Design a protein around this ligand. Structure first.
Ligand SMILES: *[C@@H]1O[C@H](CO)[C@@H](O[C@@H]2O[C@H](CO)[C@@H](O[C@@H]3O[C@H](CO[C@H]4O[C@H](CO[C@H]5O[C@H](CO)[C@@H](O)[C@H](O)[C@@H]5O)[C@@H](O)[C@H](O[C@H]5O[C@H](CO)[C@@H](O)[C@H](O)[C@@H]5O)[C@@H]4O)[C@@H](O)[C@H](O[C@H]4O[C@H](CO)[C@@H](O)[C@H](O)[C@@H]4O)[C@@H]3O)[C@H](O)[C@H]2NC(C)=O)[C@H](O)[C@H]1NC(C)=O
Ligand SMILES: *[C@@H]1O[C@H](CO)[C@@H](O[C@@H]2O[C@H](CO)[C@@H](O[C@@H]3O[C@H](CO[C@H]4O[C@H](CO)[C@@H](O)[C@H](O[C@H]5O[C@H](CO)[C@@H](O)[C@H](O)[C@@H]5O)[C@@H]4O)[C@@H](O)[C@H](O[C@H]4O[C@H](CO)[C@@H](O)[C@H](O)[C@@H]4O)[C@@H]3O)[C@H](O)[C@H]2NC(C)=O)[C@H](O)[C@H]1NC(C)=O
Lengths: 293, 301
């Protein structure tokens, strides 16, 4: 057993059919010692007595809020969370894994340090999330995450849909030109009723880069059918643009798209264009399209 | 009065004609209390007695090394330095100021944190220097300076020459990309015989930048008299070169000397000279800091 927060405890449990439950002692935080009574928010009536209650916790009915009582007045109360372990494996039932069997998908528009992570949920009901820096050493990269939000978009995998969640985070210390020598190691804590699970990931910001679409994609004709198309870097992108250079791909929407490093080209013809980091093969941006007219 | 180092004290003195000198008590660092006598390395014979010597210090003869004695044997000794103050202003007589009336001139070849400061001296005799971080707060910029060295070069100002000194320094904490939020505050301690003075300066490394000359300035002709000249960034310059960009100036030889040079951001150009020298200097693309020394080659093919 281990403490998640004040008077909230997590109990690791083996979920095999004939598993021996964990015996856990829960003492009351009070000076009195007589007439002490215990109750549960799952079971009806008195389920124990004495300042310290000793119980065998295997099923979820053994979880919930345990309250002390003496002489009709309430005292302290402790909460028990369950962490399932089946076949030696920690349960992964709150989250729905992506096609690649991973759970967390993060993406960043620039090297500033800001990024967002998102996840899927199997059933959006009675959920509680909490994200933080896994490693807490001095030579670790400190991260300050925001609050998790339910997304309007519903992902469709197999032939089934799933609600998506998302959270924004910012990296504490940065020196933009420098190379990242160790990754950002994250850990997601998930609660659902009295079930506890947690998911971890490590990554470098460079691998999660996804620029924003190019702005002001304008047109100007020249001669019969030939036309020059121009645009400009997005406002979100890192500066200076001489350092965070970009390579753009140009396709024609009625793969086979051709790369152009300048911010304009002439071609005969929808005209769609996406962006990518010039020097690193990171994720490309969303397409910015305009009619070939 | 205040202690500079073990048994070396500094005495601030008002140098007006009729100023009352500061009376300072000097006790001996010894357990004995009898038969105690004092001497000076300036005055002849015994100049005092008693465990504690009380004197009025106004002129420089009142300075120097004061030694204790008992029965012909030497005891401890303390050294006194004077800081002159005239019309409320602290004296600046050991160093010779540059044309711009400043005393310290520093220059750095890159944003690494390394840089050097130099000064002139009025009389190169019996000198002792020491440079350090003036502010000693947590949010100050810590700097580790070296030892002052006599330079071979002798500057000539007006119609008179002066010996030059220089010292190299490195900033404790650095992050090439980092923004400068507070300046480097330095302080030079200068000693000359029994005279004490000190000079202070504040600056951002960006303002003292002076790049090294561009390397490998090659030529290759093309057409009549026309020829393309190419080069590359100096090895000393900060990396990556994509971030620490430069602006180059190109002149034709028959801080920044900006009279008939034309700017070129690329590392090569084509130009007509048909003989002579082609000189080129460098500068930071984004900041108007000091330019580098010229790199010249003959316009020959
Ligand atoms: C560049 O050059 C300038 C010019 O030389 C130089 O400037 C000076 O810097 C030095 C060192 O930083 C300063 O010296 C310090 O002065 C401190 C203050 O001293 C005064 O106040 C004392 C008050 O004592 C009373 O009040 C307290 C209240 O708390 C009480 O307890 C006491 O009992 C007492 O009642 C006073 O006593 C003292 O008097 C002495 O000095 C005067 C002359 O100033 C003299 O006339 C007296 O006879 C007597 O000798 C003075 O008036 C002082 O506290 C400090 O010393 C302590 O702290 C150090 C910390 O390291 C301890 O090691 C040490 O043991 C003491 O506890 C120190 O002496 C000096 O005042 C500056 N002068 C000026 C004009 O600014 C710069 O530093 C140079 N720059 C660089 C980078 O080198
Ligand atoms: C993701 O999910 C996993 C799975 O739940 C989390 O894993 C566990 O993390 C916790 C917290 O980091 C670990 O707990 C600690 O355990 C150590 C060591 O305890 C062991 O050795 C002791 C030797 O003296 C022994 O006494 C302990 O015995 C008790 O526990 C066992 C069960 O392990 C039980 O059977 C006994 O009856 C006892 O009750 C145990 O064998 C312990 O020293 C730690 O104590 C410190 O922290 C507590 C909490 O504040 C504090 O009160 C103490 O004073 C002390 O400062 C702490 O309890 C646990 O071991 C991990 N388990 C596994 C399998 O890895 C993981 O943390 C999650 N990740 C994230 C990022 O949250």
């Amino acid at each position: 057993m281990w403490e998640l927060e004040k008077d909230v405890y997590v109990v690791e449990v083996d979920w095999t059919p004939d598993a021996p439950g964990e015996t856990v002692n829960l003492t009351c935080d009070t000076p009195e010692e007589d007439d002490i009574t215990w109750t549960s928010d799952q079971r009806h009536g008195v389920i124990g007595s004495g300042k310290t209650l000793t119980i065998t916790v295997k099923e979820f009915l053994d979880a919930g809020q345990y309250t002390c009582h003496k002489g009709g007045e309430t005292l302290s109360h402790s909460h028990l969370l369950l962490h399932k372990k089946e076949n030696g494996i920690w349960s992964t039932e709150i989250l729905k894994n992506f096609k690649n069997k991973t759970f967390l998908k993060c993406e960043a528009p620039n090297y500033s340090g800001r990024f967002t992570c998102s996840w899927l949920v199997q059933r959006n009901m009675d959920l509680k999330f909490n994200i933080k820096s896994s490693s807490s050493s001095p030579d670790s990269r400190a991260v300050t995450c925001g609050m998790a939000s339910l997304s309007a978009e519903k992902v469709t995998l197999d032939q089934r849909d799933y609600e998506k969640y998302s959270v924004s985070c910012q990296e504490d210390v940065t020196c933009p030109t420098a190379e990242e020598t160790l990754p950002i190691e994250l850990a997601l804590e998930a609660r659902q009723q009295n079930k506890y699970e947690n998911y971890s990931t490590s990554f470098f910001i460079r691998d999660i880069i996804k620029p924003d679409p190019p702005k002001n994609l304008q047109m100007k004709p020249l001669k019969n059918s030939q036309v020059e198309v121009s645009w400009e870097y997005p406002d979100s992108w890192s500066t200076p643009h001489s350092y965070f250079s970009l390579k753009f791909f140009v396709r024609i929407q009625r793969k086979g798209a051709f790369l152009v490093e300048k911010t304009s080209t002439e071609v005969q013809c929808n005209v769609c264009v996406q962006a990518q980091d010039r020097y690193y093969n990171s994720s490309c941006s969303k397409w910015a399209c305009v009619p070939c007219r």
